[PDB]
Design a protein around this ligand. Sequence first.
Ligand SMILES: Nc1ncnc2c1ncn2[C@@H]1O[C@H](CO)[C@@H](NC(=O)[C@@H](N)CO)[C@H]1O
Ligand SMILES: Nc1ncnc2c1ncn2[C@@H]1O[C@H](CO)[C@@H](NC(=O)[C@@H](N)CO)[C@H]1O
Lengths: 143, 143
Amino acid sequence: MRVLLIHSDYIEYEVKDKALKNPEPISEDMKRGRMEEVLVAFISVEKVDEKNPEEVSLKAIEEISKVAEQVKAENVFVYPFAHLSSELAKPSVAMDILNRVYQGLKERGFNVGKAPFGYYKAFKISCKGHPLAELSRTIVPEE
Amino acid sequence: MRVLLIHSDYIEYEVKDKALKNPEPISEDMKRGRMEEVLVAFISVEKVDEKNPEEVSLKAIEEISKVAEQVKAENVFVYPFAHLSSELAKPSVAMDILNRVYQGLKERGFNVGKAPFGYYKAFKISCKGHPLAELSRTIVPEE
Ligand SMILES: Nc1ncnc2c1ncn2[C@@H]1O[C@H](CO)[C@@H](NC(=O)[C@@H](N)CO)[C@H]1O
Ligand SMILES: Nc1ncnc2c1ncn2[C@@H]1O[C@H](CO)[C@@H](NC(=O)[C@@H](N)CO)[C@H]1O
């Protein structure tokens, strides 16, 4: 898994064209979204993650939790961003892992947001530009 | 080298704290910048690139040129983004390569922008969300 963490003043998204034949069904209210004072977690689920979705998910939850706590972000946004990596996991596994990360962070008590799965989406973000506002992490199952 | 290409309506940046002891000296006019209808090239220069800065630079110029042409972007912005990778090249090599990519794209006839080197910078971007608006590329010297 490849994660790009951007501590932002805000993040907005707008669902555009479907990127998969059968994307996540959504309502009008879910086509757009916004969150402020948030640690945006752009995530690309990789092929190697298919070996152990739960393990990789839990590792990601912990890593994202540490960063959020370190930068003082109470809000976290799980953003599907396949193009962060070149070796992607199949769609169902990406969906599974993206959901597990979201559920885990929520269960940990963070205010968490997410965007619909299976779409090309426009987005607007404002990075704080602090020393720790931009971080990358590679999380893979223990081999 | 790791490159994240985001076709955007605009990109703005604001230089914040110095990230290096001796960053690129700049004027007041260079602390901030903006470009519209642009292919933003977030670049992280990697350790392996130190083996052949010119080769990697020329490969990057070609790859970025192809994408810009494919998405119809006449404007390109070379944005230093070290945290895209985990194995970074030393600062002088990153500076060298970031400059070579900028010079090359300019010499190729594109309208090119750049941000000062050696700083933590805040930024605002708006991604178009088209199928090809988000792309990643790994460019390394021929081993
Ligand atoms: N391995 C993977 N990791 C993360 N997301 C993945 C995925 N495989 C499929 N997706 C989902 O399908 C859309 C097109 O790849 C993805 N959408 C996106 O990556 C948008 N940022 C494009 O604008 C995402 O919803
Ligand atoms: N290997 C490398 N690749 C790209 N940029 C590099 C680099 N080594 C040093 N820099 C420059 O120094 C700042 C702190 O790493 C870098 N700044 C940044 O990455 C800002 N986006 C932080 O907000 C950049 O100016």
